[PDB]
């Protein structure tokens, strides 16, 4: 008789994995013992299609950080997680002064210390994050670009003047909370090709669902 | 109310719009079975 599970909040709860940073010792990948991750909630595959059910949305995100070595090991290493709000400058190097700009919230924690966890508010200067924008910002490549949907960047790095002694891997989970949505719309039935637009494969246009032989046979 | 693709048989890219509607004609004699399907919202087939 109850329908608590079919609510928006119920549907979008759960902290999913949306990011993974690699900080190897020897490597082509993030060679300066640091990394910048612009917040992308599409990071959880399944996500995109779920949110793209609505035209507008609003919510808060709870971020939880999981860090270890590639084998999932724990070591005595301290870390800095920096959140650079949109409009704030991300660090270009492992010594950029951005790391010390008070206006960039930062949180420190040892790998041993349990997961780091913080809540981030509804940033957008607009009244709601909008997944679809039918226009351009005052044939073009700026089509469908609602920038005021930026949540910010997360800069991660080993604390200290020198490179870390261990190879590290950070995982970022994100639980969406206090959700409100407007204007529902057709469930994506075609495969996604790009993170930006809704473009699809005009050759590989598949029928929404399983087909059959005749309309008289089951 | 959403359109149920009962006629989920053509797959030929340009005939996909045909899945949305099935037809009836003079050629069909009295008693003939026009169409059939199950009440399986979540399973494959029409309800998708």
């Amino acid at each position, epitope marked *: 008789h109850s329908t608590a599970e079919t609510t928006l909040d119920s549907f979008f709860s759960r902290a999913g994995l949306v990011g993974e940073i690699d900080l190897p010792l020897k490597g082509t990948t993030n060679p300066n013992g640091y990394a910048n991750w612009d917040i992308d909630i599409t990071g959880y595959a399944q996500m995109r299609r779920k949110v793209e059910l609505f035209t507008y949305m609003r919510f808060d995100a709870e971020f939880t950080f999981v860090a270890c070595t590639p084998t999932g090991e724990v070591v005595p290493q301290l870390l800095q997680y920096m959140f650079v709000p949109p409009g704030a400058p991300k660090p270009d190097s492992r010594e950029s002064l951005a790391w010390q700009t008070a206006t960039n919230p930062s949180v420190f924690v040892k790998l041993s210390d349990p997961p780091a966890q913080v809540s981030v508010p509804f940033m957008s200067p607009a009244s709601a994050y909008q997944w679809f924008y039918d226009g351009y910002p005052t044939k073009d490549l700026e089509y469908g670009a609602m920038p005021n949907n930026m949540m910010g960047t997360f800069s991660v790095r080993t604390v200290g003047t020198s490179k870390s002694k261990y190879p590290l891997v950070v995982r970022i989970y994100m639980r969406m909370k206090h959700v409100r949505a407007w204007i529902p719309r057709p469930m994506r039935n075609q495969n996604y090709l790009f993170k930006a637009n809704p473009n699809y494969a005009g050759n590989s246009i598949k029928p929404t669902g399983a087909s059959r032989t005749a309309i008289t046979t089951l | 109310e959403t359109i149920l693709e009962v006629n989920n048989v053509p797959t030929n890219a340009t005939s996909l719009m045909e899945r949305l509607r099935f037809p009836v004609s003079a050629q069909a*004699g009295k008693g003939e079975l026009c169409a059939v399907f199950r009440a399986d919202p979540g399973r494959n087939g029409p309800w998708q």
Partner: antibody
Amino acid sequence: EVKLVESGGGSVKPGGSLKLSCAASGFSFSTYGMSWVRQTPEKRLEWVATISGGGGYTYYPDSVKGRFTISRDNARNILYLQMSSLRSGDTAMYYCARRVYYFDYWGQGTTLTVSS
Amino acid sequence: DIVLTQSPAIMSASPGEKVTMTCSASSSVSYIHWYQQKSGTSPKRWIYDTSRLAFGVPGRFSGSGSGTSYSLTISSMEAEDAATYYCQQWSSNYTFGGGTNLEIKR
């Protein structure tokens, strides 16, 4: 059982006309489209015509469009294929098939030999 | 004017080993279907929409392919499979492939 059993054929001289027929059994005929296919001496398969579930549309390939005509009578569950101005290249074994596209069941075929 | 070329034309398996027949197209294609034809008997239905099996077909038969190159795979092979296998396309002019004579090795 679904049965497609066809009739007609034999030796015909080039230029003559012929009509082939195929009888249905064990499925509601009107709800299906029906096609003919021919097999050259056990190797090559070539589509020759289809007919819609009712009268509706007929569809032909570009080797035959002009001489063959496919028909159905949905009272006796039977396809028809009349072939006029038959040529030497029309010698083959003709199957009637049911179209669900994909061809589920094929009949056992009749054989056509166009020759002088 | 859409041609399907099948390779190889003749094949021989041990049996108990796998078998990979190929249907290549001259242009990009949406799906491919497969038939079977033993001697004296008409073509039987085998695979449709590339990877779905007709009711009868053993589970040891497989189907895949995308775009312009599709293939029917059999693992493992058994003396009851030896037939000629044709592919077919449904996009424009309904064309058949040349077939593949599958045979028993001894």
